[PDB]
Write a protein that binds this ligand. Structure first.
Ligand code: HEM
Ligand code: HEM
Ligand SMILES: CNCC#Cc1cc(F)c(F)c(CCc2cc(C)cc(N)n2)c1
Ligand SMILES: CNCC#Cc1cc(F)c(F)c(CCc2cc(C)cc(N)n2)c1
Ligand SMILES: C[C@H](O)[C@H](O)[C@H]1CNc2nc(N)[nH]c(=O)c2N1
Ligand SMILES: C[C@H](O)[C@H](O)[C@H]1CNc2nc(N)[nH]c(=O)c2N1
Ligand SMILES: [Zn+2]
Lengths: 410, 414
C-alpha cells in the first residue's frame, strides 16, 4: 500500500511509497514492535540476485536501465560469481553504494549531506601497515584543519570469513579508560575493555583522562597490529563556557572527528567489514551522551556543584540545568575554534528538510525516531513531532560482531 | 513467534526476559518489513460469534487471577456468560470483573509511564446512568473524589457499554478539564490553540465564552446516543495552580496557571469484547506534560520566546541553546508551584525511575511489561532519565484503552 506520515506540529502529511522496495527484516511483527531494540535479530547462489538488484538500481539511477552497459555489466558479474564465487565492484558502483548506504541509514540525522561524501577506495590494501596509511590519509583529509569533510575508506571485502579486514577500534578516535585499584574508572569507562586489549598487545598507556587510543588494525584475517596516529592529525577542542569562567578549570576536551570504524558496509551482496566513515559532530553527542551518561564521563554532579545548584531533590531539575550549560560549552568551544559542529536544533531542522526532499524525489525516507530525536529537549525539536517509517533499504551499514570475540589468535 | 524475548538496559547491563508477549491479542501496525513505532494512530458492533471467544478469554484470565481457574465458580460463570450472549447477543460484567478489567487496561497501557500505581485505582461503576444530567453528576463526583483538595487519587468512571452503536455514551471532551481556544479574525489565537475546534462546537451548542486565556471548557455529554448536552463544571471543583518561579520573581507576572487534574475522557475501554465508549479516567501530572508540551509546543501556549526575553538570553543563534535554557526554568516553575500548593505532581526523573522499577517487577512477576519507548521517554532531558537506555517491547494486551473516532465526526444529529 501507500503509507502516510503526519507531522503533528505542521500537519504536513507525506506519502511513503519507497518502503515497497525493502527486503531485509526490521525485527518487528504484526504483534510485537521492537522499535527500541538496539540490535534486533555468502554463496554463489545467494550472491547473484543481490548483485543483480544492486546493478539494476545503479543503472536506474544513472538513467540507463536496460542499456547495453547495463546488460554487459550483468553478464560480467554473472561470469565472475561463477568462476570466483564473488565479484568486484566498479569504481562508480563503489562510490554510488557508499553514498546510498549513508542515504539509507535510518538512524542518522545528518543525511541531508549524503551525496557529498569523499569515497577512498582502499581495496588494494593487503597489510595492517597499509591500513594505517590509508586511515591516516582519511583522518587528515576529513579533518581539514577543522573544516571537516565527510569521508569513507573502504578496505577489501570479506572473502571466506577467515581473512577479514577489521578496524578493531569501534571509532577511529577515542579516549582510553582505565580501571582504578580503588574501583573507580579513569578516562572513558566505555573503553576500559578495548584499552585493556591495547595494553595487553604492548601499548604503553599514559594513564591520563584523555589519552588517544592507538589504532588496532587487522588485515586479511591476521593478528591485529598497533599504530599511533600522528598527534598533529588528531584535532582536539578544549571545552570552555562563554559565561562561566570556571568551566575551563574542569579540564575537559574532546576530539573533533567522529569516525565510526566498527560497522559493515553491504553493497550488492558484497561485505566490506572494514569501512571507517566520518562526518562532524552534533553537539549533544559529546555534551549529553559522552559527558553526562552515568556510564561515561558522568560530569553532571561536578558541573551542578560549580553552578551551586540545589542538588537535594530531583524536582529542582538540577541535572537538566547543568545539562544545558554543558551543551552550550561544547557548541561554544568548537565554534570558537572554527571546528565544524552542528547543534541539535539546526540538525533536526535540516533532517526535516531532507525528509521532504526524499519523499518528493524518492518516495520516502527510512528513519528511526528512537535515534533521530536528540537525547535532550526532544519535543522542542521538529523531529519529535514527525512521524517516521523505519525500514531497511540496501546498500546499508550493518552491525557486526566485535572482532575480539571471533578472531582465532596466532 | 519465539517463546522468550530479551530486552537489555544499556546503562546497567540488566537483561530481562519477556514471555508475556505470547499473550498479545491485536495488531501493532508494524510488519516484518516496516516499523510503525512512531506513528501516533496506526490501526456497528461485535457479533455473537466474535463475542464468545473474547469473553471466555477475559473470564479465564479473571479466574486465573483469583486462583480459581477451572473451579466451579469459573465454569458456572463461563456458562452464564455464554447463555447470556446466546439470548441477548451481549453480556454484563460483574462488579468484581469490571474493577479487574479497568485496572488491567491501565496495567496494559503501553504508553503510560505511571503504571506502578495500576492496582490503586478507584473504579466508579456508572452503568446505571441513563441521561446526560446523570453523566454530569457522575463526572462531578469523580472530579471531586480524584482532586481530594490536591492529594490526588487515580480514578475511572465507567458508563454503560455499547449496544448497537447507535446508543453510545460519550464524553465529547477529550479531557474533562481543558482550557478554551479562540481564533481571532487576525489569525492569532487566544487561550489554548489545540482546543479551537472543540471550543467552536461548544459555542455553537450554546456556551457563552468568556474569551479569556484560561477558560475551563464546559462538559459536552452524550447519553444513550442522544444529542450531547452542555454543563458547566462547578468552578470550586476545578483545582488550579498559579505558576511562579522560585528564583525569578517576574515569572508570576506572566499570568500562567494550569489545572491540577489530568483526566482523559475520549478513549474506549475494552473488557472481554465489551466496549465502554465513555470511561473518563484521571491520575496526576508528570511536570513535563505541562512544562514542556502544554507550555512550550509551538502550536500550544508557546511561551519559550517570552520566557527567554525576560531571562535576557541571546536569541540570535540556535546554538546558544536559549530555548533549552528557558525550557528548564519553565519546568522548574511548574514543579515548584504544584509542590508549594501541595497538589500532587511528579517530575520526570522520579516517574521514569519508578517505571523502571515497575517494569522490572512486571517482568519478574508477570513475564513482561509492554511499553512504548516513543511515549515513555520524557520530552526533555531524555537520555539523563533511565528509560532512554531501556530496551522495551511493545504489544497490545487486553483489557485495553483504545482510541475511537471523535464523536462530532460520527454523531447522527436528532
Ligand atoms: C556529516 C555530518 C553527520 C552528522 C551531523 C551525523 C549525525 C549523526 C548522529 C547524531 C548519529 C547518532 C550517533 C550516535 O548516537 O551514536 C548518527 C548515526 C549514524 N550515522 Fe550519521 N552523521 C553525519 C555523517 C555520517 C556519515 C558520513 C555517515 C556514513 C557515510 C553516517 C552514517 C551513520 C550511521 C550508519 C549511523 C548509525 C550508527 C549506529 O547505528 O550506531 N553519518 N549520525
Ligand atoms: C496516577 C498517575 C499517572 C501518571 C503519572 C501518568 C503518566 C502518564 C503520562 C506522562 C502519559 C503521557 C501522556 C501524554 O503525553 O499525552 C500517560 C499516558 C497514558 N496513561 Fe497514564 N498516568 C497516570 C495515571 C493513569 C491512569 C489512572 C490511567 C487509566 C486508568 C492511565 C492510562 C494512560 C493511557 C491509556 C495513556 C495513553 C494515552 C494516549 O494514548 O493518549 N494513566 N500517562
Ligand atoms: C550505542 N552507541 C554506541 C556508540 C558510539 C559512538 C562513539 C563515538 F566515539 C563516536 F564518535 C560515535 C559517532 C557517531 C557519529 C558518526 C558520524 C559519521 C557522525 C556523527 N556525528 N556521529 C558513536
Ligand atoms: C497529543 N496527544 C493528545 C493529548 C493529550 C492530553 C491532553 C490533556 F489535557 C491531558 F490532561 C492529558 C493527560 C494525559 C494523562 C493522563 C493521566 C491519567 C495521567 C497523566 N499524567 N496524564 C493528555
Ligand atoms: C510523531 C511522534 O510519535 C509524536 O510526536 C509523539 C512522540 N512521543 C510522544 N510521547 C508522549 N508522551 N506524548 C505524545 O503526544 C507524543 N507524541
Ligand atoms: C534502548 C534504546 O534503544 C537506546 O537507549 C537508544 C535510544 N536512542 C538512541 N539514539 C541515539 N542517537 N543514540 C543512541 O545510542 C541511542 N540509544
Ligand atoms: Zn515496530
Amino acid at each position: 500500500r501507500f503509507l502516510k506520515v503526519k507531522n503533528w506540529e505542521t500537519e504536513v502529511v507525506l506519502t511513503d511509497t519507497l518502503h515497497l522496495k525493502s527486503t531485509l527484516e526490521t525485527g518487528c511483527t504484526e504483534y510485537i514492535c521492537m522499535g527500541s531494540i538496539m540490535h534486533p535479530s555468502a554463496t554463489k547462489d545467494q550472491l547473484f540476485p543481490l548483485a543483480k538488484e544492486f546493478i539494476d538500481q545503479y543503472y536506474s539511477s544513472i538513467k540507463r536501465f536496460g542499456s547495453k552497459a547495463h546488460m554487459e555489466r550483468l553478464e560480467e558479474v554473472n561470469k565472475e560469481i561463477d568462476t570466483t564465487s564473488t565479484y568486484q565492484l566498479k569504481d562508480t558502483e563503489l562510490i554510488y553504494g557508499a553514498k546510498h548506504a549513508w542515504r539509507n541509514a535510518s538512524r542518522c540525522v545528518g543525511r541531508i549531506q549524503w551525496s557529498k561524501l569523499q569515497v577512498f577506495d582502499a581495496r588494494d590494501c593487503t597489510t595492517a601497515h597499509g591500513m594505517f596509511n590509508y586511515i591516516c590519509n582519511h583522518v587528515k583529509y576529513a579533518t581539514n584543519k577543522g573544516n571537516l569533510r565527510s569521508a569513507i575508506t573502504i578496505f577489501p571485502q570479506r572473502t571466506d570469513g577467515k581473512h577479514d579486514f577489521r578496524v578493531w577500534n569501534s571509532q577511529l578516535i577515542r579516549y582510553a579508560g582505565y580501571k582504578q585499584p580503588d574501583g573507580s574508572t579513569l578516562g572513558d569507562p566505555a573503553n576500559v575493555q578495548f584499552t585493556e586489549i591495547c595494553i595487553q598487545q604492548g601499548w604503553k598507556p599514559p594513564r591520563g583522562r584523555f589519552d588517544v587510543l592507538p589504532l588496532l588494525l587487522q588485515a586479511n584475517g591476521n593478528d591485529p597490529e598497533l599504530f599511533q596516529i600522528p598527534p598533529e592529525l588528531v584535532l582536539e577542542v578544549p571545552i570552555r563556557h562563554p559565561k562561566f569562567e570556571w568551566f575551563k578549570d574542569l579540564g575537559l576536551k574532546w576530539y573533533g572527528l567522529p569516525a565510526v570504524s566498527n560497522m559493515l558496509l553491504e553493497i550488492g551482496g558484497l561485505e566490506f567489514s572494514a569501512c571507517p566513515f566520518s562526518g562532524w559532530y552534533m553537539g549533544t553527542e559529546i555534551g549529553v551522551r559522552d559527558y553526562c551518561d552515568n556510564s561515561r564521563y558522568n560530569i553532571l554532579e561536578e558541573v551542578a556543584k560549580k553552578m551551586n545548584l540545589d542538588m537535594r531533590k530531583t524536582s529542582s531539575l538540577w541535572k537538566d540545568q547543568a545539562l544545558v550549560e554543558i551543551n552550550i560549552a561544547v557548541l561554544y568551544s568548537f565554534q570558537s575554534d572554527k571546528v565544524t559542529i552542528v547543534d541539535h536544533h539546526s540538525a533536526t531542522e535540516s533532517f526535516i528538510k531532507h525528509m521532504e526532499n526524499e519523499y518528493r524525489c524518492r518516495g520516502g525516507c527510512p528513519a528511526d525516531w528512537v535515534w533521530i530525536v536528540p537525547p535532550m529537549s526532544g519535543s522542542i525539536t521538529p523531529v519529535f513531532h514527525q512521524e517516521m517509517l523505519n525500514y531497511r533499504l540496501t546498500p546499508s551499514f550493518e552491525y557486526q560482531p566485535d572482532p575480539w570475540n571471533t578472531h582465532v589468535w596466532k
